[PDB]
């Protein structure tokens, strides 16, 4: 039973990434090594973020939910955008290719670092918990969110981006960076159940994806 739950969680977390990799044509471009490099960049950025937080921010001893601490973590999440920009600049190709390579490598590296060890230890436990399935869905939500963030960073980094679009891109990037903090604050405030929190995260990610896609299409058409 424990093996069945672990296998289901691992399959649900991993197969969507493989499907995206094959369908997007990255396999055709032999992008696997570029994705590995992106994951290494993610590891470096995450280490830098942890070092920055430890060096500059003492832990608050207040029992009440650390609103300042979560806000600071979201502010530090800008480092992930900087790393994605660095990866895209390092990677040569069409904008869609750069966005997809950066997003896939970043999301895969986060998934490996943050969820595989918890999946391995927890899902093989005797006790069945929905949390592992929820985390497997959350990894897919993270993958979509990273795709959206990479597309936004590419659009903002475009030299030809019109000034009218630029504030919209900046606002979308701001929302993407602060999405985790906003979701945690909302879940804490409403005492939302884990399924409701996952659904809300999915809805917010979908809305961000749709807005980013619409802006991307508008920017591409304005130059086509």
């Amino acid at each position: 039973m424990t093996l069945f739950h672990f296998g289901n969680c691992f399959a649900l977390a991993y197969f969507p990434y493989f499907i995206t990799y094959k369908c997007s044509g990255l396999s055709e471009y032999n992008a696997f090594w570029k994705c590995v490099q992106a994951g290494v960049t993610y590891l470096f950025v995450q280490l830098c973020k942890m070092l920055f937080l430890a060096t500059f921010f003492p832990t608050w001893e207040g029992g009440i939910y650390d609103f300042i601490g979560e806000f600071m973590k979201a502010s530090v999440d800008v480092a992930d955008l900087i790393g994605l920009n660095l990866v895209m600049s390092r990677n040569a190709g069409k904008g869609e290719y750069k966005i997809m390579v950066a997003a896939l490598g970043w999301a895969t590296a986060e998934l490996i670092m943050s969820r595989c060890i918890p999946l391995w230890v927890g899902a093989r436990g005797i006790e069945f918990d929905w949390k592992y399935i929820q985390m497997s869905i959350d990894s897919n939500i993270s993958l979509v969110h990273y795709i959206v963030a990479s597309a936004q960073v590419w659009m903002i980094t475009r030299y030809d981006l019109y000034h009218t679009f630029r504030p919209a891109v900046l606002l979308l990037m701001f929302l993407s960076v602060y999405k985790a903090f906003v979701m945690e604050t909302f879940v804490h405030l409403c005492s939302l159940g884990s399924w409701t929190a996952l659904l809300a995260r999915a809805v917010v990610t979908g809305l961000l994806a749709l807005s980013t896609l619409a802006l991307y299409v508008a920017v591409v058409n304005v130059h086509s």
């Binding site: 093996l3 069945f4 296998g7």
Partner: protein, 177 residues
């Protein structure tokens, strides 16, 4: 129909279902693939050309024909290794399915005697025939042992009926790998 024979029949049915599932997985991952079809056809064509050349090649064939045989054996061995690796991917998938199947069997047949053996198993196989059974009767058959026998019987027969069995030429060359 006593629960023991019902369990026996259920195990036979499960072995059939698992053989069909393993063949379906192998078909989806291997048999349908163009790489597999191509490698299989290449192996058969090279084997037949090698045999026909060995038959046509008298001792008077000369070092050059011998070297052509060696080069064809090398090509056949390489193609057979690639074919084996493709089959091995299916073997791994079936292994994972077998891990899942063992969990299902534990959930259904734990501690239950599923069949009576008409013979005393040899001490080296008793650890399988009486595995996870309560009792001293070494003629008690464990679900693991009955499933193994059923799978060994059914899988090859199903492959042969469906024509999915590896070709005898491919098996003869796989003997080398």
């Amino acid at each position: 129909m006593s629960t023991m024979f019902a369990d026996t029949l259920l195990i036979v049915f499960i072995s059939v279902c698992t053989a069909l599932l393993a063949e379906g997985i192998t078909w989806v991952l291997v048999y349908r693939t163009d790489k597999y079809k191509r490698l299989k056809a290449e192996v058969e064509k090279q084997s037949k050309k090698l045999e026909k050349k060995k038959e046509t090649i008298t001792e008077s064939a000369g070092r050059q024909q011998k070297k052509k045989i060696e080069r064809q054996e090398e090509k056949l061995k390489n193609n057979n290794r690639d074919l084996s690796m493709v089959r091995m991917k299916s073997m791994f998938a079936i292994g994972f399915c077998f891990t899942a199947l063992m969990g299902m069997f534990n959930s259904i047949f734990d501690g239950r005697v599923v069949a009576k053996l008409p013979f005393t198993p040899l001490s080296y196989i008793q650890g399988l025939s009486h595995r996870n059974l309560l009792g001293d009767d070494t003629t008690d058959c464990s679900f693991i042992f009955l499933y193994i026998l059923c799978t060994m019987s059914i899988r090859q027969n199903i492959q042969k009926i469906l024509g999915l069995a590896p070709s005898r030429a491919a098996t003869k060359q796989a003997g080398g790998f």
